[PDB]
């Protein structure tokens, strides 16, 4: 009565600490399944806070979402201008990951990356117009953030409960802020004046 | 006794591989032989397993469409024009069995919407004053273009990106600049 005593005894320990996986302060998990997930919560996809959690070993997979505040910053780009003076604007997005469910499933993989280039693609484009209706005088001069707050308003919420599919909302992203590290006049446009 | 065994190990497989699960942002097509059967909900259910298979059709996930071009404005100048087109789908009934490829279809139909449209206005104008316009009228033109179809998409809005003329004039098409300069 001691091989089948002990043998039960060490992999039942073993066991235990594989199912036990534990959530970090600034991190998310989903559990899976196998090619589906668990839901839970009247039909509502679980995300867990950072705390202890059991899933049954081989079973269950976690994918782990960082929930901090993450920082996107664009390298110098130009901006054209109403009279045609590009204007070589540096900035940085920053946002929060809203709906860990949605977000995993868009930006396949949970990759911050991905999100990334398709903020990137959305405050370029988005900036374009903003700048191309106003003049050098007041984008150089703006101290309120008056074209990168619009830039998020229309990030946030767009035209037309709905949640407009060219919006942030719709995917799991937030941008909480928009800055721009440098609007200084290039040379080409500053000979001029 | 060892016919009972077999029937029981079959059984067992038919079960376990049955029940599936479809996530949040996708939706599951279960579809008899020939014949569509119904539209399964997320949570846990049951297929029989070689009678129907599902498909899942993302009804959540944002899909991107760049649609660019250099078109031809109504004055015979060139604009360097960018457009994205955000859009979602809805029930796969239509969308599967509709029209081939409706993604892509959407990419040839936000060509010929915003080639359209931008022919219209002239380059002066779509650059600062037009892009409040060419937005409006690009987004009724594409919702039209797509309708005959029955495609399963559905636009909610579709925002127009830039409009930034061609590199040549960039940094050209200013000499009344450059003679007021000299006039200066």
Do not use: C
């Amino acid at each position: 009565m001691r091989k089948s005593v002990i043998a039960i005894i060490i992999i039942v320990l073993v066991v235990l600490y594989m199912s036990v996986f534990v959530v970090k302060e600034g991190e998310r998990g989903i559990t899976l399944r196998f090619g589906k997930v668990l839901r839970d919560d009247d039909n509502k996809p679980l995300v867990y806070e950072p705390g202890l959690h059991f899933k049954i070993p081989f079973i269950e997979t976690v994918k782990m979402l960082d929930a901090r505040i993450q920082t996107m910053d664009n390298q110098a780009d130009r901006f054209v201008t109403k009279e045609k003076k590009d204007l070589i604007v540096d900035s940085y997005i920053k946002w929060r990951i809203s709906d860990f469910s949605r977000y995993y499933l868009a930006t396949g993989g949970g990759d911050i990356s991905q999100a990334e280039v398709l903020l990137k693609r959305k405050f370029s484009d988005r900036l374009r117009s903003e700048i191309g209706r106003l003049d050098v005088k007041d984008i150089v001069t703006d101290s309120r953030g008056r074209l990168t707050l619009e830039v998020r308003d229309a990030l946030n919420s767009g035209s037309a409960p709905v949640i407009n599919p060219n919006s942030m909302a719709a995917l799991g992203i937030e941008v909480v802020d928009v800055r721009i590290k440098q609007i200084n006049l290039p040379t080409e446009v500053s000979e001029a004046i | 006794r060892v016919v009972t065994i077999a029937a029981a190990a079959i059984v067992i497989i038919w079960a376990a591989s049955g029940f599936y699960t479809i996530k949040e942002a996708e939706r599951g097509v279960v579809t008899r032989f020939g014949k569509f059967s119904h539209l399964v909900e997320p949570g846990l259910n049951w297929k029989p397993t070689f009678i129907d298979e599902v498909k899942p059709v993302n009804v959540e996930a944002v899909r991107e469409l760049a649609a660019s071009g250099v078109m031809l404005t109504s004055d015979e100048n060139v604009v360097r024009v960018e457009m994205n087109v955000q859009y979602r789908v809805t029930n796969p009934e239509k969308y599967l069995y509709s029209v081939t490829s409706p993604d892509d279809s959407l990419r040839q139909a936000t060509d010929s919407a915003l080639r359209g449209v931008i022919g219209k206005y002239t380059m002066d104008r779509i650059l600062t004053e037009g892009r409040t316009v060419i937005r409006s009228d690009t987004q009724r033109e594409l919702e039209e273009t797509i309708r005959p179809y029955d495609m399963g998409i559905t636009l909610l809005d579709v925002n127009f990106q830039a409009a930034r003329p061609p590199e040549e004039v960039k940094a050209a098409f200013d000499d009344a600049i450059a003679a007021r300069e000299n006039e200066q």
